[PDB]
């Protein structure tokens, strides 16, 4: 999360928390829609080119944080889990082509004031409040700028930090890349021209691109962090996960399992 | 020493780290509040 | 292998610093004896019948 | 369950907005 | 002698009650803060 | 396990109780030979 | 005097090299806990008497 | 990081049920006596 | 000790063994006289020359070792001590001078199969056993051999070991030695004609010169491996205190605070 | 204490001498 703001508490009590059992790593920020289960960047899962196949009793999830490292007594809650439940049609090869994964637990987790899970799209909203110009909030703890080359200032976050951005043209977004464009991909993020840079960065993935609904003023996070050339460049935008559209898989394992 | 026994074959009964952690962190926030709160 | 290092089992690391590594408690432990006592007591005892 | 979900205990159930919950109204077309 | 605090793994809220500190440590903390609620005690008492 | 006349120090306030390990060590070394004792026997 | 380091107190180590270092009791704790909750909540509602 | 097995002193017998085991230790002791008694049981109990 | 042999089970039932909390080290030897009280070498606990102003709280004594290390599980006793007491005109400044020094129980000390102290040496069989020629033995896991220097082999102990050796004319103690000879003081070895190496060594000290009487074959220790100048050398002897010459203060001693 | 020192449960008190116990014996003077 690039040029943001140390984040309000409670904004997001979906917000979960990814984390690398051994050795101690945030490798991604979650997607909380249930008391067992979760949305999440498949390639948050495994990424073979970067080597990775992540199991469930590999990694955990830290439920309701503030801080991505001083614990939060009696408030964090951090369940195991039960079964990850990745997409097949998950393809990393090529773009990450439904890169997105959803997950249930090994025990439920009890919601509280810190802790709620975001709605589900549903078809009108859906493609409703998807257009571009769009400003939407996101979330997730990732890092900020481009790490592992030269660059001062800081490194990692402490707390949650918030990202409001608008939704842009798919055009604009297919001329920006190298990378095959989906009408399930979609970026955002804040042309040359306008004044605010800032977007998501590595790590933030598995995040939810969340949008508070008009007709009810309910939330929606209607978008997965899958990725971004680089870490908000003018020109440049972050993509994400097509929730709604990839919507169907999800539920029909849900419907199954949970 | 044993008093609080419970079966001679494993002796003595105590409390566990876990017991004792949790009765501190209980235990020092609250002080810490009325202290804070006197400090002011 | 010629000399002799010690066993560490089950354990984690604690959420906070502070507390870190966490162990089986007595109870965990206590159990977790007899959960092998019983087995062995027949592995053993199952020598004796065959053996006379 | 849903039909409970996307209520922000300290806010849309307890009435109130983030520092900033303007924008994405005000982002819709036009301000509000 | 050997380090790196070993090889262990995160503990799970489950761990809690079947998995405690160390004995040592916990004292540790439990006189370290003591100790601050004294001499903040005798701050108190004495700068007024 | 307890209550008030099998302990004289006992406090709720601190949760269940259980051993010690001091109280398991005795308990596996004890217990442990003589485990031995009847295989390094048998194994004659 | 900037960072942090946990305190680990009250450990000695053990004659037999295996059982190495030895961490007090539940009931060793405990017991110390409640010698500091005595003074303390004293010195406490000390406090407050003076302050109403 | 740290090392040395820090800095503590031999315990005095009066010690004992005063200053116990570290858990984890314990357990893994314990493991290791049952197996060699498991295989060597086996080691028995196929001998014949 | 040097020249030795690996001691057998109980014959030294007295034989303590003084260590010291940090670092756990293996100091001196000691002696076992009763369930409170063991006597020993005062240079062990101080020595400024060295540099050592021991005390209780700062070491205890291993009583009924065997191996000079590994722990003897259900059988060694090891225990705090309780109050140190020196003989003020203890002399190391000249020459060591009453070099002995005794301590007190923090808790008593059963005394089992190998748990027993030595007796008392009295009057009569005093000077009655001290003599030339007369051999005596002694205990202790200290060395044997020249530690700082030229020597390899054998340097430290596996388990308690052995020594037996003739009492020496003070002529031959005090030629032989370039230090004041004293009445409490004296040596004790095997001459160059005779054929049998061994002596006290360092370390060796706080040890028991033990010697058994012919009388009620009892075992009467009367001197305190004191020192000597290199370990086992021809014409050089181990020197060993004068018990019952300074026995006096002894009794004056736990009279006492016994 | 004392009026019970000097012996070894595991010669004296049992009956029996040490590897080497004549030695001292065989030092007073001469041999026994
Ligand atoms: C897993 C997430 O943490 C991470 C988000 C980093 C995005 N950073 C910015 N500034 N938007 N996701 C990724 O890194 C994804 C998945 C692995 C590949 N990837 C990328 O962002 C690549 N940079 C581009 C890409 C490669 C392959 C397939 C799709 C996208
Ligand atoms: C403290 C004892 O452990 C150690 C044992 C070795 C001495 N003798 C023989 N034969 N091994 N004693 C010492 O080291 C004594 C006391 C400290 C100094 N010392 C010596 O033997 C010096 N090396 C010589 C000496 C000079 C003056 C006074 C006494 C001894």
């Known amino acids: 999360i690039v040029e943001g703001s140390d984040a309000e508490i409670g904004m997001s009590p979906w917000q979960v928390m990814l984390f690398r059992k051994s050795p101690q ?15 999440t960047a498949a390639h948050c899962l495994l990424y073979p080119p970067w080597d990775k196949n992540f199991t469930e009793n590999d990694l955990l999830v ?14 964090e809650k951090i369940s195991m889990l039960e079964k990850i439940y990745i997409h097949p049609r998950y393809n990393w090869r090529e773009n990450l082509d439904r890169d997105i994964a959803l997950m249930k637990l090994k025990k439920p987790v009890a919601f509280s004031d810190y802790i709620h899970p975001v709605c589900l799209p549903d078809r009108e909203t859906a493609a409703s409040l998807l257009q571009a110009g769009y400003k939407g909030r996101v979330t997730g ?12 200032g800081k490194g990692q976050p402490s707390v949650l930090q918030v990202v409001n951005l608008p939704i842009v043209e798919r055009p604009v977004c297919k001329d920006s890349t190298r990378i095959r464009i989906t009408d399930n991909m979609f970026c955002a993020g804040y042309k040359p021209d306008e004044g605010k840079r800032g977007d998501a960065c590595e790590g933030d993935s598995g995040g939810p ?23 908000d460049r003018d020109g440049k935008y972050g993509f994400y996960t097509h929730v709604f559209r990839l919507k169907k898989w999800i539920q029909k394992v849900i419907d199954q399992f949970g | ?24 962190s209980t235990y020092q926030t609250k002080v810490d509040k009325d202290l804070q709160s006197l400090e002011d | 292998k010629v000399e002799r290092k010690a066993p560490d089992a089950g354990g984690c690391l604690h959420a906070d610093p502070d507390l870190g590594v966490l162990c089986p408690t007595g109870c965990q432990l206590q159990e977790a004896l007899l959960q092998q006592e019983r087995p062995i007591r027949n592995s053993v005892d199952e020598l004796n019948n065959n053996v006379e | 369950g849903e039909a409970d979900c996307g209520l922000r205990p300290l806010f849309e159930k307890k ?14 077309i036009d301000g509000r | 002698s050997a380090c790196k605090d070993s090889d262990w793994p995160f503990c799970s809220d489950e761990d809690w009650n079947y998995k405690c500190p160390s004995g ?13 609620f004294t001499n903040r005690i005798n701050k108190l ?4």
């Not at chain 1, 703890?141 to 001062?152: Q, S």
């Not at chain 2, 876990?18 to 501190?24: E, K, P, Q, T, V």
């Not at chain 4, 009435?15 to 005000?26: F, M, Y």
């Open chain 1, 141 to 152: 703890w990732g890092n900020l700028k481009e790490t592992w080359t030269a660059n001062v």
């Open chain 5, 24 to 36: 040592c440590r916990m004292k540790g903390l439990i006189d370290e803060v003591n100790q601050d």
């Open chain 1, 25 to 39: 790593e945030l490798l991604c920020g979650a997607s909380l829609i249930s008391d067992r289960w979760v949305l």
């Open chain 4, 15 to 28: 009435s109130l907005e983030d520092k900033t919950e303007r924008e994405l109204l005000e982002s819709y």
């Open chain 1, 62 to 75: 830290r439920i309701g944080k503030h801080s991505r490292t001083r614990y939060e007594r009696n408030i």
């Open chain 1, 209 to 231: 691109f969340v949008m508070k609904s008009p007709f009810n003023n309910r939330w929606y996070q209607m978008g997965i962090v899958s990725w971004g050339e680089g870490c």
């Open chain 2, 1 to 24: 020493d044993n008093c609080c026994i419970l079966d001679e074959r494993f002796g003595s009964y105590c409390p566990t780290t876990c017991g004792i952690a949790d009765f501190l």
């Open chain 5, 45 to 48: 008492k004495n700068s007024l």
